[PDB]
Ligand binder design. Structure first.
Ligand SMILES: Nc1ncnc2c1ncn2[C@@H]1O[C@H](COP(=O)(O)O)[C@@H](O)[C@H]1O
Ligand SMILES: Nc1ncnc2c1ncn2[C@@H]1O[C@H](COP(=O)(O)O)[C@@H](O)[C@H]1O
Ligand SMILES: Nc1ncnc2c1ncn2[C@@H]1O[C@H](COP(=O)(O)O)[C@@H](O)[C@H]1O
Ligand SMILES: [Cl-]
Ligand SMILES: [Cl-]
Ligand SMILES: [Cl-]
Lengths: 523, 628, 660
């Protein structure tokens, strides 16, 4: 029994169902919860000997690295795989296109299913090369930043991979932002180019996209050129001559292959803004964390198919709609529309349509379907799923049991992934087919994450279980953000200085007698 | 006997003379024709196992490659030696300078022999490094393009190698071109710099070089600086302060070594313009093709000396005057003048002077020397020669016999080489000392070249020998051109789309019972509309048969649905009467998509108009008419 | 054996390295004995590929391997080493040591006032270099650019140099004693895109103006886009130009403490160091990356006998090549601590050098004979106050060391227990050329002894231009083949490079020095042959000083020459003719030279004459001014070949009257 953790008193360990293993294509990646702690204890006491080999296994290098880990949280100088060189789009596209060009890559589901398509890895290589050819033709090169203002569709996945192909950092801007929020993000990074579309389709209603760009671009002198996709092909849309150009028109000029550009492990892969602050992520570190978590926390295999019902304007689409799954050579499902269009059975038609084996979504949608589309679940077949995931905020133990039976049929594993934009990948989450669940908890911290609670009053680490306090990590990890663009002081003041030697997550949590962490919300 | 390939009837096979092997420095690279077929068959079925090792033998790499071959013709994404890095100037200069800096590299014969000279590989490394140093200090870098407007002399070779040393792509503009032809090519490539000379010398006559550049440059805003070599040192030649700088003045400021810049295998090495279309060639694949063909088709050894009587303004000078021979580390003769100056024995005086072992020339020049200078050949010792090459057009059996008797004394091997600017290197040619000749035939296709004859109407491959049709290639090869600069769609529409799954040479050919290919003339207008091959020339004739039409012009343009579409412009309801005329005389599917009637052939203008001898005022009415 | 030519060597007892040297040596020496050295030297000459290849792979960390050890020839000016190789200078001097031992001292910084002293570990140095490199990167600095440095000899100068080299750019360090005109010359010749400087300096307790001289020069340096200013004094009265000048502490705060180093080619330029020549224009000497670094590591390791446990105190300034190679690159490459002294040997008193050695138990001390002369004159009494027993190697740099100063150095600083390394070299050699290896080569006081690895030294007859075979000889000192750390060019002026070093004696490198070789093969430097004047270790251009004096509108013509000086080694004497209080104007002209070049270029004396001796062509005959400034007027010989032989009498009278 727990005197402190009131959430822990009387909670049955929900061992992973037996049908989860009937549906695995191959022997699971970690046998039992006992091997997970042998691999975890090594990843904390011996990061060099744990992440080194994994980096060599999961990523393809253009130059080997000479030092696995360097720096400290106190000094904000973390670095991983120093001296190595790779390319993000080579690991996400090329190396799978060479292996099996016809394997699906981007299973795109448009607003209207009448506008849906699928890109094989061989097609994704030809389209990324042509868009990278355009950007290279325009003078975009390693060290530049390129803004993206696109809905959740193929064009966004291609623009990011194309920008990363040249060694430039893509700064994705959620399609729903205003001209002001566009102006602020473009000017902070001094983007030299922007990729966008004429207008989108969000649940039947068409959205003004180019209009908001033009309104914002009038205060963005750094933007030399804009690439515009024809999502609707509406001719009343204005393109300023000499600045704006058409996706289809430019890409038609360049070949289906462009060489990737090697970047250093610690070269910025992208900027993502949360005044807004631009979180910066390294290349090697972020990519490894994205691939590891997707392989272990979701139990992804070459045959699997991931449907992250998120958006690339946020970190969830970055890591688990794009980089995570494509690094592993599995197809990912890119959903442009809403969970209510045409009706509340769209998520479920798609899972049935493509036999998706993993589903990843935030609770905020589970409360929308629990309070509207609870009947549409039985229409469609959801027998392909092994793993179901929660991302956004905490997951009610109510919605947990709802998410488990209605969508999972009491046959799936459920992983409640805790993590922020600054972490890059999952921090605390239960591994599919390994970690038994406690409804409402994130469970054990992931490889390389040395979680710890700190008494906010004294600022000392709270040893022993059955306790609460501020959540903090005692060392940095590969996918940790390395700075805030052009403002490292705010980066230190926010994460590294409140508790020297620790990384301040900004949340409060509790650890029960079993070690399971309970996320008690922001402080 | 042959019912189709009449050229081949009663043609005695011509074995390589005994003197060829007496003059050969070492054992030949291929023992006999049976070893050649074994090697060729592997180059087709297993290009990875064949070209992989050769790329590691013949080229020096800064970064290893992980995949030999990628892409398909149908997708226009061919690539070779992916992930690899190298430098063209290192493989053509540095590595040979280190091994033997005193070995001759450029044997330069000037317009007047008084000005001839010889650069060793050591000399070439210093002179290339110094020019590259100037370009580098000017801001030229990987990704840029630099134009070259120079005669066929040492400075042209140095300029090309210095540009490639920085990872930039050179674009060589033949020195005979006008100011307008210069204007078009510089602007299409947006060259940041130009390398040229004040004036040229050709046949004793002074040519204006800088004068035409100044004339062109007024409309080339991308050119930031020009390097000017004092070829004549004429003091009346004006240099624009702030833009033009002297070759000798700037090179004096920089050292004789500059580190080469590594580039990717598929980074552009150069643009070569032919509306002129800028043919783009890769780095690794092109260089491997240049070395392989020069080695095996001409039988080049380190002891040899190559004289390619061509100009770097064309692909022949690119591949077989520069990259080919310098990659293999042998000396190459760079001839600045003409075959008639000071007299009609100059070619042969040069061979004798430098004891050249290999001679490579176009049939056009052989015809001129046969007509006006046959008496001069016997005056010179040409016994150093072993291989006689022919380039640019099929060689008549008569010209073949003349070439064989009067130049080779019936003692040399003759290699009629078929290829084109877009192939980078030889496609069909008799390997020196290996393949016996049939006069007028190019014989067998080369390594990596899977040649086929396809029916021009159906696009289906013709099986069996004693056949004729369109010459097409079933898979890309290392030195195949990769795109047209900033215009990959024209590249696809010209080479890959007309006959999908094949490369379209634009030539017709025939294959005899021994598998020897006989290049025929060019094929005609092939416009492919939903699988129907249409003739724009054939449609114009039909429209003109209508007594209401004075003149008619038909062209082809890209179409997202049907592949291509034919648009007919007509100079004099009526549009319906003309479309039926074409259906009856040609065929039902030959009707133009559209028939536009205008008030007033330079079709280069109609293609750009419909896509969206001079009389420029009509252009406005045609643009208005197409909309109407 | 007696010498008919090398008189310096007659009756000179050979001086073995004392026994106590090896007692204080931490490990087995890097070279077994002098016979192993001869074998290794012979291979470095006959087989440089087999010798320098392995050493380059031991001492440097490479991002890409090299395929050819050595290329090019002196005659063609195309020397190159380790071709195809890639590396980074800041990685080899910082990163690789920080990963191994982040807490090991790297920069032992002794400020002008010891109250301000501090110590940076290799870990600290990595963060501060990364932050400065981060600022430069955000400003647009990239491989191929040049960045000027105008800083005193403190930690920030070292960080600026390493941060510039981290990006693949080349730093150009401008000695802090230079005026705005000398800053102007160097920044414009190199077209520096940025400048790193400080608000004010501290030297001898007195505040020096640094930023003020930059603003004065920068008004004519249109290539400089941004300036980084360190708050050395934090004086708030120092103006920063909005849009151009930015504070070191403010900008570095914006960037993280790690930045990836940029790989550069072995032959990409590492730095420019502007040097005075026979013209009035400084020539920017350019050094490669790989070859220069290998030379710094090789010489520092084998000539000084540096081990990981050791601590090096090079009493030099990064404004000159001595600080470049043996205060920064040499010791940091080997991963040992180096003492960076910002002050003077006289402040607070004439024992400061020894307080520093004792404080930090320095094992290696490297100093100029000019300072040894000063301490013998004014501070000998201070030595007995300090424990100097940590020292074992005592070096001398920049000028000839008198046999007397050698003995003083040996007895009073080394207690007759240390090895002395008289090191001969020059800015253009990058590293040592001729020097006694510590613990290996016995000394002849005043001789540089044997040439170092890769240095094939020769003496050339000045009359015939042919190499002199056999020993007991003298002539022009020349080197028969290039070496790894040899300078590669003069910036954007390779013709001056060829005309100065390679063309005078084709097939050879021309040091500009004369020398003699005794029967034991020891070399004895006889000084410059090319009328280059060395004042307190500072290479000066008499032509540049003449130009400064003429800028005064009262001067018609001026001639400057060099003469021996008991204090500074040599002194420049200026003869001035006016167009027309003398001692007054003499002060106004000396100040004129201070304004245009720097305070350390000021003439010792200014003699005012009516006419300068001239040829019939009209050129000034400085050969006569030199013999007069010395008491060798009786060696002038026939002067009827002058166009004004009567001026000679007035020159002898003027020098006698005004010198003093
Ligand atoms: N599984 C979870 N349980 C509770 N809170 C979560 C979970 N996942 C994410 N969060 C919250 O979401 C925040 C992430 O913010 P951001 O990713 O920056 O939009 C975290 O700081 C947590 O407060
Ligand atoms: N041996 C040959 N026989 C027939 N045509 C040739 C031959 N060599 C080159 N060509 C033609 O020359 C053109 C290529 O130009 P070039 O490569 O400069 O000779 C193409 O139209 C080829 O068909
Ligand atoms: N050990 C030494 N003995 C005599 N002269 C030296 C010695 N070291 C340096 N020098 C002189 O200092 C010059 C170096 O010039 P710099 O290093 O540019 O000031 C040499 O050319 C010599 O004239
Ligand atoms: Cl090799
Ligand atoms: Cl080895
Ligand atoms: Cl000089």
């Amino acid at each position: 029994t727990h005197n402190v953790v009131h959430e822990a008193n009387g909670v049955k360990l929900r061992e992973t169902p037996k049908e989860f293993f009937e549906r695995q294509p191959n022997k699971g990646h970690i046998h039992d919860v006992n091997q997970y702690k042998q691999m975890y204890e090594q990843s904390i006491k011996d990061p060099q000997g744990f992440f080194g080999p994994l980096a060599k296994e999961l990523l393809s290098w253009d130059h080997d690295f000479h030092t696995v880990k360097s720096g400290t949280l106190k000094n904000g100088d973390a670095a991983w795989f120093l001296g190595g060189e790779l390319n993000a789009s080579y690991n996400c596209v090329d190396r799978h296109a060479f292996a099996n060009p016809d394997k699906p890559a981007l299973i795109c589901e448009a607003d209207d299913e009448k506008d849906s398509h699928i890109l094989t890895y061989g097609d994704l290589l030809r389209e990324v090369s042509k868009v990278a050819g355009v950007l290279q033709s325009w003078g975009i090169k390693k060290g530049d930043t390129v803004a993206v203002y696109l809905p959740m569709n193929a064009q966004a996945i291609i623009a990011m991979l194309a920008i990363a192909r040249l060694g430039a950092a893509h700064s994705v801007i959620f399609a729903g932002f205003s001209a002001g929020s566009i102006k602020d993000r473009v000017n902070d990074a001094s983007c030299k180019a922007l990729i966008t579309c004429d207008e989108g389709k969000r649940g039947g209603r068409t959205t003004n996209i180019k209009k908001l760009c033009d309104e914002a671009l009038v205060d963005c002198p750094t933007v030399e050129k804009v690439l515009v996709y024809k999502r609707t092909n509406n001719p009343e849309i204005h393109l300023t001559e000499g600045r704006d150009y058409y996706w289809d028109v430019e890409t038609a000029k360049f070949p289906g292959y462009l060489p990737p550009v090697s970047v250093n492990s610690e070269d910025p892969l992208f900027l993502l803004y949360t005044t807004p602050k631009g979180v910066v992520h390294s290349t090697a570190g972020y990519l490894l964390g994205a691939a590891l978590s997707t392989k272990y926390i979701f139990d992804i295999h070459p045959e699997d198919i991931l449907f992250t019902a998120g958006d690339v304007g946020w970190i969830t689409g970055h890591t688990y709609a794009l980089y995570g799954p494509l690094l592993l050579g599995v197809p990912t499902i890119i959903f442009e529309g809403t969970p209510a269009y045409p009706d509340y059975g769209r998520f479920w038609q798609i899972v049935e349509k493509h036999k998706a084996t993993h589903f990843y979504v935030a609770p905020t949608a589970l409360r929308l379907l629990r309070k509207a589309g609870e009947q549409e679940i039985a229409k469609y077949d959801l027998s392909s799923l092994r793993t179901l995931g929660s991302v956004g905020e905490p997951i009610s133990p109510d919605i947990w049991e709802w998410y488990n039976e209605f969508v999972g049929k009491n046959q799936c594993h459920i992983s409640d992934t805790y993590w922020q934009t600054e972490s890059g990948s999952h921090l605390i989450a239960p591994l599919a087919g390994v970690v038994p669940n406690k409804p409402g908890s994130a469970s054990y911290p992931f490889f390389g994450i040395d979680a710890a609670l700190i008494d906010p009053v004294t600022g000392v680490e709270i040893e022993g279980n059955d306790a609460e306090g501020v959540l903090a990590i005692k060392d940095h990890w590969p996918s940790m953000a390395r700075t805030v663009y052009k403002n490292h002081t705010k980066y230190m003041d926010t994460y590294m200085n409140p508790y020297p030697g620790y990384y301040f997550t900004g949340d409060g949590a509790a650890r029960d007698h079993d070690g399971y962490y309970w996320i008690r919300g922001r402080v």
